[PDB]
Amino acid sequence: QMPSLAPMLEKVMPSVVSINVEGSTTKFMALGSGVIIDADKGYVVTNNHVVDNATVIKVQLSDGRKFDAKMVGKDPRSDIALIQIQNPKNLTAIKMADSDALRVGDYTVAIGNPFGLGETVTSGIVSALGYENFIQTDAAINRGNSGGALVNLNGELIGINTAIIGFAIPSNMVKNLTSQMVEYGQVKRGE
Amino acid sequence: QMPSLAPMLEKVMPSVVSINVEGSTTKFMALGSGVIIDADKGYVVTNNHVVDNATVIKVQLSDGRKFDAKMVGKDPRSDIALIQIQNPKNLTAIKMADSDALRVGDYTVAIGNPFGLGETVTSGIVSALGYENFIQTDAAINRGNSGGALVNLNGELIGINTAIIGFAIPSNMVKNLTSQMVEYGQVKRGE
Amino acid sequence: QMPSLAPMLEKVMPSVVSINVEGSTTKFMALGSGVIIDADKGYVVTNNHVVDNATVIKVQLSDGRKFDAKMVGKDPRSDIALIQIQNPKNLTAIKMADSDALRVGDYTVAIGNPFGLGETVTSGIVSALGYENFIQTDAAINRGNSGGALVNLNGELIGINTAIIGFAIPSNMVKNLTSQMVEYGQVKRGE
Numbered sequence: 001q002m003p004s005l006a007p008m009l010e011k012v013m014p015s016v017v018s019i020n021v022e023g024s025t026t027k028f029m030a031l032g033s034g035v036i037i038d039a040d041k042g043y044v045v046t047n048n049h050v051v052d053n054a055t056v057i058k059v060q061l062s063d064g065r066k067f068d069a070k071m072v073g074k075d076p077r078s079d080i081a082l083i084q085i086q087n088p089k090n091l092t093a094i095k096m097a098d099s100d101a102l103r104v105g106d107y108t109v110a111i112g113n114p115f116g117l118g119e120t121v122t123s124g125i126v127s128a129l130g131y132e133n134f135i136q137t138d139a140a141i142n143r144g145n146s147g148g149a150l151v152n153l154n155g156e157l158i159g160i161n162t163a164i165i166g167f168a169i170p171s172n173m174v175k176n177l178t179s180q181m182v183e184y185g186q187v188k189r190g191e
Numbered sequence: 192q193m194p195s196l197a198p199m200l201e202k203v204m205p206s207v208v209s210i211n212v213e214g215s216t217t218k219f220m221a222l223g224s225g226v227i228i229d230a231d232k233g234y235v236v237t238n239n240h241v242v243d244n245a246t247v248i249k250v251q252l253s254d255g256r257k258f259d260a261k262m263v264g265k266d267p268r269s270d271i272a273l274i275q276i277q278n279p280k281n282l283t284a285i286k287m288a289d290s291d292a293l294r295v296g297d298y299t300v301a302i303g304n305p306f307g308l309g310e311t312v313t314s315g316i317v318s319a320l321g322y323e324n325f326i327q328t329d330a331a332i333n334r335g336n337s338g339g340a341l342v343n344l345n346g347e348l349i350g351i352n353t354a355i356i357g358f359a360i361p362s363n364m365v366k367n368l369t370s371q372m373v374e375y376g377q378v379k380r381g382e
Numbered sequence: 383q384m385p386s387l388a389p390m391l392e393k394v395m396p397s398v399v400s401i402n403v404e405g406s407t408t409k410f411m412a413l414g415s416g417v418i419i420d421a422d423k424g425y426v427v428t429n430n431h432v433v434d435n436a437t438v439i440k441v442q443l444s445d446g447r448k449f450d451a452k453m454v455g456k457d458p459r460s461d462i463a464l465i466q467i468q469n470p471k472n473l474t475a476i477k478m479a480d481s482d483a484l485r486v487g488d489y490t491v492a493i494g495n496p497f498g499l500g501e502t503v504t505s506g507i508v509s510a511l512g513y514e515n516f517i518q519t520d521a522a523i524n525r526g527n528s529g530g531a532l533v534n535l536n537g538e539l540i541g542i543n544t545a546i547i548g549f550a551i552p553s554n555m556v557k558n559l560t561s562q563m564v565e566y567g568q569v570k571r572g573e
């Protein structure tokens with residue numbers, strides 16, 4: 001009856017996972033949110049500040065299924081990391097959108113795991129586009145605990161939220177980075 | 192012409208009252224917001240942290256009419272209290288909605304009395320549903336001064352905002368609690 | 383395809399300029415946002431806390447064109463000041479709306495220059511209307527760096543944001559003040 005984001009979120013959530021890290025750096029237990037970017041390979045994109053110095057990475061799908069995961073790549077620069085699910089089965093990958101098509105007045109939605117109690121959704125608009133970090137929005141407060149996905153009304157990934165209003169690495173940037181991790185195990189800066 | 196919440200708020204506001212407390216605890220003057228939950232009896236639901244240790248409770252309707260009120264019940268647990276208007280006349284009660292029907296992407300509106308200058312309205316969506324406190328939303332910042340009603344687009348009460356993003360006791364929870372106060376003068380926990 | 387404020391913002395932005403001050407008070411470099419209120423005269427309205435104690439005022443249009451500007455009036459009271467562009471050419475003035483027509487549930491948009499990296503847009507609704515400062519909204523957080531324009535869905539100026547949720551001097555108030563500066567070089571309080 002009344003307008004709601006519930007419908008689209010019902011399509012997106014299956015791509016959003018929750019991360020539980022147990023590493024060290026001379027214990028230490030961090031926790032975060034992630035997005036399945038490749039269903040067959042089980043490629044989950046996330047914040048580097050969550051999986052950094054991890055000994056054990058655990059992933060849980062919105063349906064409640066739990067999996068193990070391993071690091072495949074990371075980049076302190078953008079706070080973007082890539083993990084891979086162990087024995088992935090029946091996974092749903094988010095569809096990425098063309099960041100370049102983003103306009104400021106655009107409505108965005110941020111999904112995350114701020115307390116480890118599950119997923120939290122917030123809304124806003126694109127505040128600024130083209131300090132650093134390509135995307136800025138009021139849809140996600142600048143929290144060192146707020147990462148996760150940045151999605152548009154069509155439920156497509158426009159960016160990944162990170163900590164330094166909020167800043168997110170735009171999806172095109174994320175595609176380029178992560179894929180670069182898959183092939184090189186790391187992101188090679190240019191010249 | 193342009194979309195606005197003004198229309199629905201014009202229907203809801205008559206159910207929203209403003210509370211002015213004057214108690215003690217060995218003066219002390221607190222102030223808050225409330226919602227008329229029963230028009231005939233003049234049952235106004237509110238935050239316990241506002242009416243706690245009250246000697247004198249005063250209520251003012253959005254039309255400007257002032258009334259006296261007495262405590263009927265309270266519950267430190269959920270920050271929910273119930274007061275009753277003295278000699279209530281021509282009152283409007285809010286219609287409660289089924290909390291269980293709540294979905295995250297849902298739009299919500301919070302109404303309150305943050306400065307004693309009148310009512311303040313803010314909007315957001317249901318961030319999280321099923322730490323504690325059943326409802327979480329970005330429509331009301333986590334303020335020890337922000338309580339009041341949590342309403343949906345149809346102008347129905349979905350919860351009462353309280354202090355520990357924001358957390359609200361869902362309406363079904365509120366119904367159960369308050370009614371329990373009416374009959375027992377207090378809320379009896381289970382086993 | 384999807385609803386967005388981008389269309390209307392595309393019409394409004396040309397009226398929004400960015401201010402760069404270089405004054406003193408025994409250097410000192412401040413920066414802010416402004417709104418072209420008169421295209422022929424090049425009258426730009428802004429916050430007093432930005433142009434106060436200015437030796438040099440510089441303005442840059444959203445298209446990138448830069449201009450010099452001089453003070454014509456100011457008012458510490460409301461944090462409203464008026465500057466005039468030197469040799470103004472092909473300027474666009476914002477259309478002001480009737481503040482008196484404002485209702486609380488109304489959607490608003492705030493435009494500003496919080497970091498000097500360009501314009502930042504945020505959205506919200508009118509929280510409170512009729513402490514001080516006529517307009518209150520969640521569309522602009524209470525920031526000593528957040529000033530700029532307060533606009534409605536039709537892209538009309540309903541107020542100017544200022545620092546003391548957010549507070550803005552309503553447009554009618556702004557019209558009265560600024561015009562009073564043009565004629566008297568200052569705002570003469572009444573009796």
Ligand SMILES: *P(=O)(OC(C)C)OC(C)C
Nearest residue numbers: 110111112140141146356
């Ligand atoms: P975050 O900026 O905010 C939580 C702390 C409520 O946004 C998340 C949902 C990505």
Ligand SMILES: *P(=O)(OC(C)C)OC(C)C
Nearest residue numbers: 301302303331332337547
């Ligand atoms: P609160 O969380 O915020 C005020 C301090 C602006 O929300 C009220 C309107 C319930």
Ligand SMILES: *P(=O)(OC(C)C)OC(C)C
Nearest residue numbers: 165492493494522523528
């Ligand atoms: P401000 O209250 O917020 C920035 C600090 C993000 O709003 C501006 C855009 C007027």
